[PDB]
Design an enzyme around this catalytic site. Sequence first.
Site, PDB file in Angstrom:
ATOM      1  NE  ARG B  51       3.912  94.446  27.294  1.00  0.00           N
ATOM      2  CZ  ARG B  51       5.218  94.233  27.168  1.00  0.00           C
ATOM      3  NH1 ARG B  51       6.088  94.864  27.959  1.00  0.00           N
ATOM      4  NH2 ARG B  51       5.653  93.383  26.237  1.00  0.00           N
ATOM      5  CG  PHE B  56       7.737  88.766  30.322  1.00  0.00           C
ATOM      6  CD1 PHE B  56       9.014  88.990  30.842  1.00  0.00           C
ATOM      7  CD2 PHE B  56       7.304  89.564  29.276  1.00  0.00           C
ATOM      8  CE1 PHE B  56       9.840  89.988  30.320  1.00  0.00           C
ATOM      9  CE2 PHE B  56       8.120  90.559  28.754  1.00  0.00           C
ATOM     10  CZ  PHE B  56       9.394  90.772  29.280  1.00  0.00           C
ATOM     11  CG  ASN B  98      13.748 101.247  27.477  1.00  0.00           C
ATOM     12  OD1 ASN B  98      13.638 100.703  26.375  1.00  0.00           O
ATOM     13  ND2 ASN B  98      14.642 100.858  28.380  1.00  0.00           N
ATOM     14  CG  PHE B 109       9.337  95.791  33.487  1.00  0.00           C
ATOM     15  CD1 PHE B 109       9.953  96.791  32.742  1.00  0.00           C
ATOM     16  CD2 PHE B 109      10.021  94.598  33.689  1.00  0.00           C
ATOM     17  CE1 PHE B 109      11.242  96.611  32.222  1.00  0.00           C
ATOM     18  CE2 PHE B 109      11.306  94.404  33.171  1.00  0.00           C
ATOM     19  CZ  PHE B 109      11.917  95.412  32.435  1.00  0.00           C
ATOM     20  CG  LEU B 118      14.052  92.258  29.486  1.00  0.00           C
ATOM     21  CD1 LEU B 118      12.886  92.608  30.437  1.00  0.00           C
ATOM     22  CD2 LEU B 118      13.757  92.737  28.064  1.00  0.00           C
ATOM     23  CG  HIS B 122      14.408  97.207  29.662  1.00  0.00           C
ATOM     24  ND1 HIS B 122      13.388  98.064  29.309  1.00  0.00           N
ATOM     25  CD2 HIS B 122      14.549  96.338  28.631  1.00  0.00           C
ATOM     26  CE1 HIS B 122      12.911  97.707  28.127  1.00  0.00           C
ATOM     27  NE2 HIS B 122      13.598  96.665  27.696  1.00  0.00           N
TER      28      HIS B 122
END
Lengths: 160, 160
Positions: B51, B56, B98, B109, B118, B122
Amino acid sequence: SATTSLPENVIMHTTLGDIHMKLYPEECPKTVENFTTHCRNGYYDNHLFHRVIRGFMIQTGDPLGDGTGGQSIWGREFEDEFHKSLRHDRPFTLSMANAGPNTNGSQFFITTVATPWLDNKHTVFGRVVKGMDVVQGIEKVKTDKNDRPYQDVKILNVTV
Amino acid sequence: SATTSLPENVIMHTTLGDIHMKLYPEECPKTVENFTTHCRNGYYDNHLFHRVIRGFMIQTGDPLGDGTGGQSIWGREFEDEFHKSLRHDRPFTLSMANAGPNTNGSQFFITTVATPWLDNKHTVFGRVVKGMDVVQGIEKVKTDKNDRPYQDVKILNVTV
Ligand SMILES: [Co+2]
Ligand SMILES: [Co+2]
Ligand SMILES: [Co+2]
């Protein structure tokens, strides 16, 4: 005769850094095909640099990690591909280890000095173009009386 | 209480180069232990960056290569380890992917920009210190509509 071009550059990731190598497929088509197909298929993943001799070379490519193993992509040992234009005449040449004429399998070595006594005895099929310092790093690790590093240095993967 | 120090630096070798990361074991001991034990055991070897979203982050660490898989070293999802001193306040932070509070497994990531939305969702447990350009290289590969690279980009191995 219609075919696909052989790869002529690889990047060997190791425990101690990355070694970028150019190959000589026009001169050594069987040796480069064997090597790059093994690379692409992950054959060399996690292989030890099982024989390291400071001031000479580092040797790897044995699934058994001791010099006795490995095979060509054809399941049979294959022929030497010597050329007068390809010599162990500078440091960081890439060459096939073997047990005498036409016994090429999968094991290979990278020299850290010129090694002319290997000319016309081992197929020279590439040379290091980036990461010479990584070769020198591997070359200097502490080894036992059989030239085996105390701490494993491994091929992680060789791309393309 | 008597134990062994957690690793606080790793080198992640990928298809497109090497990413050197510093970790925060004093703040995030469970997250760093899970990550570095998986690394040492080869758990992440050959995992896709499955991904990739330009501008990002890049996400990896799934044995299944699609976001649905992976487990912690304890075989159960484990707890978030948030700290006010650890924020997604600069590019190239290392965090746990998660599916909601306290669902940490193996996937992680690396951001390519600050991602404050985030924070406190995270676990931030490291940051890239060398190879930022490799992160940016992966970040820009061509992807399909589900953000999956057309050409596989893989973790090869993460040392220490
Ligand atoms: Co590397
Ligand atoms: Co160099
Ligand atoms: Co593991």
